Amino acid sequence: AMTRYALLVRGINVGGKNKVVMAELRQELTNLGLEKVESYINSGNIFFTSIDSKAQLVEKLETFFAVHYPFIQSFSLLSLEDFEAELENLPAWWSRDLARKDFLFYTEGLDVDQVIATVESLELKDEVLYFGKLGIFWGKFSEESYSKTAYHKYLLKVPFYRHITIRNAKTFDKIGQMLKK
Template identity: 40%
Template structure:
């Protein structure tokens, strides 16, 4: 089975350094195959015959044993990831003057955040669609950004339990996963 591993908060501003080459080697040593990464922000792909739960447990062990800081993550099967992306709304990514992010729900994500979020977004400046694993979010980019709810989520428990990828990166992850079937 093909998997996508999304890490949060690594290699940002020189903090929590996780060299992708080292992590790829560690994952291969743990028994995963065809391990590769995309950019330096914690997007990894691998294959395994193990269940998602078993793979997630092994990933947690690798991260805990080899890094002296906590790394939250989400492991998705190819079919889970692609099923969520099919649900992306038409407005997500449509306007280049807006900010388009996919916030992936990490293993620590509290589902109560879904209703909290829908109760707080500012519909004049934010559009949100929540799926099982992903929150598609479009907000203002520069003009009136401070009025968007997206500008207010940094540092909140909600934001700490998600890992954001922009529209371009999310589509590149999709392309890589689709090519792994070829």
């Protein structure tokens, strides 16, 4: 059955490199046979519909990126049904006005249980996190204490850093909206 997906990528359109023009990428994916292709902002949030199996889509996209955008070396790919399931188990604090709220989306092929063990080893300070099914909800309470959080101090040190796609809560919401189309 036709399924809608969100395809999220990291590390693009920053530092004057890894350039991806959204209009071009939407056209490319349309030309590969993905339907109703849309995007949001410029960090790599792509939505499309397909009847192909998830495994087929992952192989297609891996092949496409390896040839045409080889700096895209990880991506998250999740369905409307996956996201709806996540929306049924949101932390109560996720809706509150914390200073910063980020969602760390897992990517295809990620060793999630190892990520969880690594995150669990960090000593958390003025922050709260919850392991969801598509990624990690991670809230930091205050701009006063932000620089002392494990999020701020240690994320660049973790082995999984380039293999997660990080978005703020505003974009997390928008991803859900765009999946419902």
